[PDB]
Amino acid sequence: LTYLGPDTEVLGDMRAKGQVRIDGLVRGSVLVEGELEVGPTGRVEGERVEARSVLIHGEVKAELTAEKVVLSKTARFTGQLKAQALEVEAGAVFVGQSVAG
Template sequence: MFSKPQTKGASAPIETSQARKLAVASLVAEGVSLRGDFTTEGDLHLDGAVEGDVRVSQLTIGETGVVTGSILADSVEIRGRVAGTICARQVRLWATAHVDGDISHTELAIEAGAHFEGRSLALTPAKPAALEALTVVAAE
């Protein structure tokens, strides 16, 4: 009476939320301050402050976010403030960004209105391999 008719042939199993791993970014909220190095294999959304080095896969710094220290990441988007060096494949400075320090990059985009005081150092094809090695060492 309440049974569902069986279909012939095997269907693909449906993925459950437990079976798939979702990439969820870590969050440092506005008003939160961390002192010391921050390292994760995942992503970080920063609206608070970090005083120390940051090593992540993808870093998003919100308008209220502040990093005082070096950044090593695959991708960095900055809407807030950074005082220190940045080494990443992709770097984007939004109009509200304020960066004091050198940026080593493969791709760099700077919106009108962003403040950048430092050197822009383009990574050559050999240097991304060095960046990869640094990322592996940082993860250990």
Template structure:
């Protein structure tokens, strides 16, 4: 009965549990989790979680990453789909495509990717468009 109460209180789509792929571990295939990830090994495939993903200095991911926030120190090649903030540390090496809401890049990071920002970008373009119309009419 006690376990049933805990299950009822826990949200269905997110878990506070942290998953870890240790150095020297190689995973080939798709991974779906309800909690966050720390990757210090190698992953080839798709990683999906509603939580945060950390790719350590020795970690690498080749494929697709879909999560809320990502903190990358290692290597990523493929497609990033981050609903929140993508933070690139100075040792990060990114190649591919990125769709993010916010982007933070430390000096020294390598970011060779096409990047699309979502969220507040539309409001900025709209404000600029109104400003240009006002200048022309003045």
């Protein structure tokens, strides 16, 4: 597990393994092997968010790439995407060219 707090602004290229929950901020690119969660006030601003299963509940602005990109009602995506199962519930402002299926 790698929990970040509500106010944990990490500049630079975070490289993690295992289950991650981000609730703070990331300025840079996140490279996770395992489950990822962006929290409700979390923000992952950068270029590369690569994971295995992403649960977006806050904001993301990067060229995200995963297997299962599952979202929530208050999510906010931006940028490119490359998944295999783009599961949006209802209320994502999903702005950007994606590939799936």
